Amino acid sequence: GPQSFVHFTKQSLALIEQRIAERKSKEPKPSSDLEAGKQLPFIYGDIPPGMVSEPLEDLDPYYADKKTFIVLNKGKTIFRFNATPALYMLSPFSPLRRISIKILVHSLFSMLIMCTILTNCIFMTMNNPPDWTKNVEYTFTGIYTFESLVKILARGFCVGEFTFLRDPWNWLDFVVIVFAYLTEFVNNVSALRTFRVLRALKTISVIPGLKTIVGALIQSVKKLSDVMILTVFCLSVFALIGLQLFMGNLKHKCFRNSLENNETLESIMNTLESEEDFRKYFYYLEGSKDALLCGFSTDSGQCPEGYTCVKIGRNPDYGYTSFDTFSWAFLALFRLMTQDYWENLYQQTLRAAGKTYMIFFVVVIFLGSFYLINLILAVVAMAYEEQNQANIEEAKQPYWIKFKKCIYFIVMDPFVDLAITICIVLNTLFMAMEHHPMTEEFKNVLAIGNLVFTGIFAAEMVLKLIAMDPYEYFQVGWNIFDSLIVTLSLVELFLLSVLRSFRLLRVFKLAKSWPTLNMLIKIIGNSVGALGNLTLVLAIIVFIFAVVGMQLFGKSYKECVCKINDDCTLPRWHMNDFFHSFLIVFRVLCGEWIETMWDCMEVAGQAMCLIVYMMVMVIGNLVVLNLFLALLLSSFSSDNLTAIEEDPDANNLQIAVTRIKKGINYVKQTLREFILKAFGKIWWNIRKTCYKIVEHSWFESFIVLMILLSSGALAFEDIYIERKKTIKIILEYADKIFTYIFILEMLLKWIAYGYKTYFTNAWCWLDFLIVDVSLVTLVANTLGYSDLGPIKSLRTLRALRPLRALSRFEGMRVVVNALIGAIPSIMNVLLVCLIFWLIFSIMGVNLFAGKFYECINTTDGSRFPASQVPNRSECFALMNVSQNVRWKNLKVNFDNVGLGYLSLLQVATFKGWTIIMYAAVDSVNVDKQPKYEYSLYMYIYFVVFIIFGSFFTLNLFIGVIIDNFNQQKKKLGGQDIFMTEEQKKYYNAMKKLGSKKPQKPIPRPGNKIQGCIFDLVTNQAFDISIMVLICLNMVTMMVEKEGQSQHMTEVLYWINVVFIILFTGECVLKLISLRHYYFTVGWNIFDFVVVIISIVGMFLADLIETYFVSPTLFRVIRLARIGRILRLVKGAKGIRTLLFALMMSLPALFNIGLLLFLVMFIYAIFGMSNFAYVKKEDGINDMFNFETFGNSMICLFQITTSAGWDGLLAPILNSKPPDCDPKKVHPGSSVEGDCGNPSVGIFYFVSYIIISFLVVVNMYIAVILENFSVATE
Template identity: 45%
Template sequence: MLTSPEPKGLVPFTTESLELIENHIAKKCNEDPEEEEGLKPSRNLEAGKRLPIPYGTLPRGTVSEPLEDVDPYYYVKRNTFMVLNRSRVIFRFNAVSIFCTLSPLNSLRRAAIKALVHPLFRLLILISVLTDSILMCMSNLPEWILAIENTLLGIYAFEILVKVIARGIWAGSFSFLGDLWNWLDFSVTLFELITRFSPLSSFLMLKTIRTFRILKIIPLNHGLQSIVMTLAQCLKKLFGAIALALFFLAVFSLLGMGLFMGNLKHKCLRWPEENENETLHNRTGSLNYSPERINFYYMEGAKYALLCGNRTDAGQCPEGYVCVKEGTNPDNGFTSFDNFGWSLLAMFRLMTQDYPELLYHQILYASGKVYMIFFVMISFWFAFYLTSLFLGILTMTYEKEKQRACEESGGLDPKCQQTVKELDEENDAAEMETTQIEMKKRSPTSINTTLDILEDTTLGHREEPETSRKKCPICWHKFIKTCFIWKCSPCWVKLNEFADRVITHPLADLFLVICIVLNICFLALEHFPMSEELRSLLHVGNLVFIGIYTIEMILKIIAMHPYGYFQISWNIFDSILVVLELTEILLADVEGLAVLITVPLIFIKLGKYGPPFKSLMRILGSSLMALKDLVLLLCIFVYFSAVFGMKLFGRSYKDCVCHIKEDCQPQRWHMSDFLHAYMTVFRILCGEWIETLWECMEVAGQAWCIPFYMMVILIGNLLILYLFVTLVSSFSYYDATSEVNKEAKNLQLAMARIKSGINSMLLKLMCTERSVPTEATDQICDPSVKENISGHTLSELSNTQTFLRYKDQSSSTEKTPVTESESQSLIASPSASETVPIASGESDIENLDNKETRSKSGNGGSKEKMKQSSSSECSTVDIAISEEEEMVYEHEKSKLHKNGYERKSSTGQISRESRNGKIWKNIRKTCCKIVENSWFECFIGLVTLLCTGTLALEDIYIDQRKTTKILLEYADMIFAYIFILEMLLKWVAYGFKAFFSNNWYKLDFMVVIVFCLSLIGKTREDLNPLTSIKFLRALRVLSQFERMKVVLRALIKTTLPTVSVFLVCLMIWLLFSVIGVQLFAGKFYECIDPTKGERFPVFEVMNKSQCEKLLFNESMPWENAKLNFDNVGNGFLSLLQVATFNGWISIMNSAIDSVGVNMQPSFEYNLYMYSYFIIFVIFGLFLPLCMLIGVIIRNFNKQKIKQGGSNIFITVKQKKQYRALKKLLYADVQKPTPRPRNKFQGFLFDLVTHRVFNVIIILLICFQATTIMIQKDEQSPQMETAIFWMNSIFVMLFTLECILKLTAFRCHYFTSAWNVHDFMVVIFSITGLLLPLTIGQYFVPPSLVQLILLSRVIHILRPGKGPKVFHDLMLPLILALPALLNISLLIFLVMFIYAIFGMYNFAYVKKEAGINDVSNFETFGSSMLCLFQVTTFSGWDGMLDAIFNSQWSDCDPDKINPGTQVKGDCGSPSVGISYFVSYILISWLIIVNMYIVLIMEFLSIPSQKKSRTLSEDDFRRFFRVWNRFDPDRTQYIDSSKLSDFAAALDPPLFMAKPNKGQLVAMDLPMAAGDRIHCLDILLAFTKRVMGKDERVEKILSEIESGFMLANPFKITYEPITTTLKRKQEAVSATIIQRAYKSYRLRQNDKNVSDTPAIDDRRDDLTSKGAHSGKIEEKASIQTQI
């Protein structure tokens, strides 16, 4: 029994079972049992899972009793027994009685086990934990709560006692201390006892440990435990990525220290007038003057002093102030680069994109705008790469987990599979019958449908499982027939038929959809302030819609009977909506009823008629049900973090509130109570944590705040990212055309009938006015035929008989109504053909070049000439090609032009015999050659770049640069003439039709129009606004460069299919906007004190009327917040700021302070309005984001498959580069350096190429980085001296390395770019150290010398030198570089266009909020800086806030701007909103595709590794390793070294240890002395990697012949044996020895033993064990072989 791997029945665990286990343990101690090697645990029998169905029902007496373990792995190897409770849940215990563990048969242990496995015991613990968790989140508890807490503590202690008795203290993996959750439980209980009953209760940390009790919910739920184990596996996979992220963070932190150390202390200081002439030269670093805070310069409303720098592009001080290094760093000293710790925190902040715009401005003010490059690298590329890396690894882990789950479900026992198959067949049959019944319900042909359904015994049999099927009483049937199935008089039957015809008519569904849409429009019309007329109109309209919905419900009940009506879920939903709306009318005074219930239901009702909405909701529902444990774990973690933070920092926030604000007023974001702590954690998980961290460190110190915040950020984001990956993966299977419900089909039918009627009327009028020449034409004029033509392709209608046959098929629209014009409907249809309709024409999106086609006749024999009204001699003839050939087409364009020249000639227009025709033909030929010439294309491309670049020079200073302005005016005219000339040449060469059929040429034509309009605008002052459209000139770049064409085409193809999903997301946002209007309209107004710029307290001003009565020379302004919910449009903008987490804090503050309309807001009066924003972030942001990205990924994969698996964002030339880059996966393209023949040089060569030498150099680089880490600003002179000598030592060591390599490698040293880099580092470092010693002046700052030395740290990323995991993680980025570069070019173009537009419209906006001296639209560089911030979704709320200043009270429209003729500093809110919203959407779309490209590249690498072949570099590295094992070049290696040799090889020939079994299985020939030849090993390893087929055999023969040619002196030998035979001999000898030993032992036992034999059962077990032992011995031989 112990060795049987087959499943067995449920056998009680008895004394004999225990003796068997003890004997088995003794046997294992005496010898190594090989029969256990093949046993593995069954995933279906893990502890915590339910016992599978094939084991049958639980017999009486087996519940809560010890049973022999049904899993052979645990029973044999782990020596366990199991216990089942009534729910068939498996509990596993150790059977060995050691270390204070009672025997499994001990009555006390059996009683403890029964208590432990009982469901009520677990329920008691769960209720206790939940109660304790609720009590922990409460503050100011009454005294009697202490008794409850003591009771709960007693329950926990009792649970620990029961577990210790039942499981033992430490006796295997299933003991008490063998489970880590028990360690946590024991520790928490112990500390709670200490704090409760000892003098140590005053320690805050000991009290805080109690909050870990919340995590006890996890081990009480098996699903939560599984998710935790999965996340633990994710962390293992993420180890390399985390190490790489820490490496980059450390490097960038050191770089930040070298560049910005001490710079943030530079401030503008008012210098004393008497010392002005003496101290003006004393700038940064002045120690002669100790200023006070009042002497610093502060901007209006700023909390911290103005930063400045000594560079020309840094911030400048106003007149009377000088820039000195004084005071502390900004943000209470928490933002700086003065030491490694603060620099690391700043880099982590940039990586997580939390309030980065503030750090940008601080550094640019203090150091200069040139350092924006540093932030672009970190804040965009570094953050982008790491996010993609983490998402890629999580996606791989999730896919593997999903694959494992599928394998588990498919890997059940045959008995279990048969049971599951029977259940599936039963469910399928039930589903089929349910479908038939649903069809009966809506059938208009039978009135007794509902009665038939009720009497259907099969339905009643199928509705419930076997265990719960019960017959309904006859009286219940009679009651339903009487009360819910109405069969009355014939008049009622006629009414029933009439109602059925009404509700099933297609126009009824169309009418209802129109009503729902109008109802939503009426809801969206609500705004503040609203006139009484409009209010009454909306109220009447609401009553009308309620009446319509009520009539719909009544008609459906009459037509379907109540029983049939309530069998459909949507009807139940409609009835609930009607009841609630009627209740709303009755309870009109109850505020908020419509907001919380009715409005969302109306939006959901519209989704009934939209298949995309239903499909997405179905996917979302199934996904959330599958991920319920992950969602629950996330909620538990958020709750735990909030309680932990409240217990840890709550008292500090109360006691030290004055440290944050001078007036000691309470803060909005704190952790003094649970709600605020929960909101703080929620804000951290939303990505905004740095500001609350500053406040936390201000009140509680750095020691606890930083670890707590890092815990919440890291663990919380891991959970959110994993949830995001799973949801995106689910939505990536979305297909809008997968199904269409009956309501959607009715809408299609109604639209088709309406369209058919309109077409019939129009065609009748048209056909009556003119005579029809032929019968065929008459048939074509028939509306039914016309309708069918639009749904078919040319190939389907090429035959006239086939074409005319459609008239007969569609002559009666009533017979087949669903087939009418399905392809023309906006609602997707599953039967719609994917071919292109003739009526609608070829889509410009699918083919931006709008290629023309050549059609053949029906038989394909003769070609038809296509007549063209405006064809041309040189027009291209583009044959219809597939999407895989689109890019090839672009490169073959010239050939197509040339070949299509004669074919496209228009003989009807030009006579080839006439002289004028020949002249015109030659002119067109010449023009065609000109425009297709490569030099002409390069010239036009260069002119396009120059034309685009000149736009950047037209900033606010253009009027001051007169010469530049004149040159630009002449340049504009020259560019316009060049482009007009180019357009004329193409018109002549291609003709008008060919020119305007190409969308890229249309774009060029539009740009020419822009040129002309801008030139016209300069002629007259009243037309001057036309010059502002000059920014559109940059769009011409799209048509000139192939890379941007490819990216734009791919973006359109992956984005357009998401329109339906985007509309669903837009409806969700409209729902939240309408709810926001209902909740907050008119409530964001406040009375402002103009002297302080702050809001009056509510005890001084309570409403608008009191505010208007306060007169201090003028009335107090009753102002509205710039972002509000006064109408749906403002609501959308506010929601966008919430979605991008920019400015959302001020919006939430206004919401929670709101009191009522025309009421003064009060601090946190409406605190629970936080729930509105939490719900929106979850259901309005996170889930729609998953939907959109999932559908985009699906379209991306579809387009990628169409192009043969290649990247859709690269050109044909780049695909070749991509294939070349793939060699970097395994090969180092650098050729090996030849070893010198000189002994000394050879010794040095071996030294510098040894791995130990490389490790030493890497360690030196790390030590040198450590010396930079220990530095800080304003350190002591002794520290400065020590660091100088340490740097000198490192320079000398690196110089010695350089000399050694130069001596060993000779001239080959400079063939490696890495060596050249090291050489330059050494030269610069020596120069930086020696120059101050020789001339006494620093030409290179010491910090820069350190940074130059630090650049050597990139050797850690070098393939073959640094950690291999770093190399593997960098490969996706390298392979995706071509596509990322193309997408980046498009991003730059978009930024360029928007920057020019911003310069034209916002250059003179008043500087406040987000627009200042650094971030503005005055120059092109500043505009690009602003747009970079918006690209990362940061800071755009402040810029828009400044642009909102359009009133006299906020700006001055008559302000004179020096140096220009433009007046005013006001903005344009409408233009600003359109500007930022459009840019955010476009940039988000492009960046999402960037993420997808890199993640997909990361996911494709494992498949590439599996499918790759060996390259020349692989063989070269093989022989390089061989030389180490065969230094004498004998071509042989000893068989004992074969395992080490295989482990020393590089992938893919690499074979990790233990590998002896695999090597033996290769059956390698062996010569005398157990030696193996090099060629035999190479051929065997190659065959192992590449497989076995004819192609591989050919490659192997080529390898062998090549080896013979390269080694003509190969030693011939006759193999005497093979590795397989030698292993068989060794194993056979071992078996013989064991058999003989066993024989001798049996003989001794027979002679000595006189005891009686054991019982029959034990004999049977022994015989089985002996028999299975023989089988396992044979299996072990095969395994070893």
């Protein structure tokens, strides 16, 4: 009832006084719909005029026993105050209190606070401020203290409930104000400035709605405790393994053999300091800051002649890349898990240790890097789903009319829309014809075409504005959008490159008839509508991190610049000003946090840089993951509610095509009428026998064996095969036997099944094609035409012989069926991605078409400073004088749209993007020498692309593929689509190990002493003691480092042996107690196995370091100690269920990995055939090339995770001199030239990184998600 708006008065105070007396004599829950900060329930109607902003009687009967009152605001919101006098001094009936209450509840007050904070956030962004900013900061301090004073006068400082301090954000405000006065009066200055950034967090309190978003983020991070415990445990175990294997291996360097003046290695090392001193004694690659790593094994790196490998000096990367201590190994393993610049660590470790150590990296990448990330993503997805389900549940709970009608007949016809769409597509494909060396006539025709198109669109705008008044035309969003684009077109016509590319957004008018291009627009709209608060929170967090980093490290980056740059000039990525600080933060969010962090530590301290970078990484990645998953789930579920019918009013394009097909039918019928008016019993048994043979298990197994042999025979064709002439001969004759073998299998299948039943089968078609290629090659070789151009090039298709195992192997067939099922949606999303990226490609072409050229000194590879050689003519004149000068260009650039696509791919995958960004921000003009950051703010182009392109396009791709797989599963009837029928039974049986009830306790024995042992060992105290013992053993394993003294080594050995005896004793006690019942438990036999292997390993390691010298075997055998610490899983129910999810998911991951390995084998054979002789550049070096099956597999595993593919592609884009030598003679071989094939290289790498994107990530995520959902149930 609206009569409840009674004022809080003296009689009300007296009534509360009598009620409190009755409460004292007395020696429920408040209404949620009436809680402060919400609107009044609609039962209370409209506020009376004299009651707004006045202390009203408490409307909630829950607070009828307490001196609390209510003040109502214009805008219908409730503030819940306290009637206990403020400061024990000012009663609620006071002029100051009334005025302050009105001020605090007014909305102009909140708007003023918001404006003040947003203004101060701009003065926060000055690396050095002008001397007059002290008055501005005094003004800001005055405004903040006035606001706090008003709040305190309104609701009491800290006197009971609903006072100033009772809100946790008022704590932040109070801390801000005391710091502001203490720093101005009591007066590290940089640390105090970092505390000025605490004033930015008041935006969350001021702006409505951000507080609940922050609370949701915190309640989400509270759900990740088990996953982070598992992550820390896994990283610790892998760090212990790495510290065992690679301890000190990264200190290997090549040292001079011949030393003068009786000098020794230690005498040399006690004197050197500078890199110019080290370069005289150790082998340094040209343009390298670190000494070249070598190794003592056969497959490690090779020192040059006259240099020998020794372990001395510091680790690479300023000394931060190492396994020499547990902390550094942990940092390396965290880097490996997050896959940030991990390929450099891969190559360094392989070179220092050996190429057989890639198994460690394989296991780490495919167990910790992918599975833990998928677990984190799945847990966050569950958290969002439950939160959204709760939200849904709570929500549920005279002469002018002549032309008006004429142009309305004209322009609103369905055909006009189709014509406009055709014109839009033509305009896009006409803008996409720009390149760098464009002749003047081509430029003229492009200008004329653009003029014609903008004229057509302007005429169409004028026609639709005279056919219907502005009051109705400007009522449509598409009409407003088209109007903006066209008026921009006329502006640019009357007057740039940007405003020319503004026209390209007209492509989004095809989203009406393109359902999977409307999903992209829905995602983009959700990012600024439903999830606008999440986006705003992310922006605020990024701003805060950028300003904090600048305030902390800007002065250090300028003081200590010679420690990180030889020229003593600021590097490319630094934190000396706000823009570069923001760039560093954004790069960290993109996922590159180690290369900038090394310079951070070098200039300003390991502790500070590590703390700041870890905070940034964790919080920023959490917020970005929340936004990503929210967008994905909201767009791909909430949009599915069957809102309106499927095109109720058919689109003008649909009506136009309906009319067109009607006219086609009419023309067909009329033309048809016009032209008609004008004018053996043994054969069946043979076939049955062939069927019986081809269907036999022996025949199938024989064929599978021959397929495997013929696939493996391809791996012996290295470049070193001329050293293996007997093997060459053997492999040639074996090829003929195999062709004869697969030709007879082909003829029996023809006579056994029938031509139709054969040729209507894709697997048989594939086998038919492969054996046809083999037969043609054999015939051509027999006739002597073995070198006939295309015939020779046809010999490279022998790498497809492995493709005959897909049909043979059931798991690989099951997996490959899902991909074929999902192909159409892949094509749809790929077309959407290409159309979307065409806009950015055309924009980049118009921005940087031909501006990446520069005049380099080819010996140093250093650009000549633009003071000398300011253009290409001066570069040419300088070449005429010198010799090692060149006017070079980047290999991946923006010269045309085709190369723009490759540059955009490199940017979007974050591999090789830095070179393009550097060239783009250096670019001056065409035929002009680039200057250092002449166009600095071209970084914004790449930022916007990485956001709109790299992020929303992955939100669209993941959604459509996960929907396709779900639809396939539902088509099969809720059956797993990655598991075979034989594996389904194992999966079903394993699913029952996660729910079996506890069995009966093992009965007590008969002997008295045995019973006492039983009561001792069956105890929670015993279990806890075993757990703490394992923890202590883990700590003793962590305390081991490189260079530890022999005394510490011996004491650690004895500490370990006593742990061995303790665990063996507990096992023996449990055996003598539980009799034969001990082995009925999986954890018990695991403990027994661990005990015996630990004992055996200790003995064997002692043997292999006493009667035999084999350090590698000793290091490997000492890994048996990790069994003692793997037992912590037994008592951790939080991580045990996640490991059960992994165990559940193993069967499907096996099939996926089998398919991936076959694909990698095929690509390795192709790489060996083609890129075996390219020039050693960039990522193609002496140890990572395509000259051998092992090297090829190493490179392909490296780029399966999409790492270093730019550096492997770069040497292949060479094709003409002086980049390559087409007539180079290779010793020991008949091949000539070291040039690459650009088209083949581009296709190879793009298709291989496309296969990995849809397999190692799209098939991996799905399997892990379903099985986590199963294990957590």
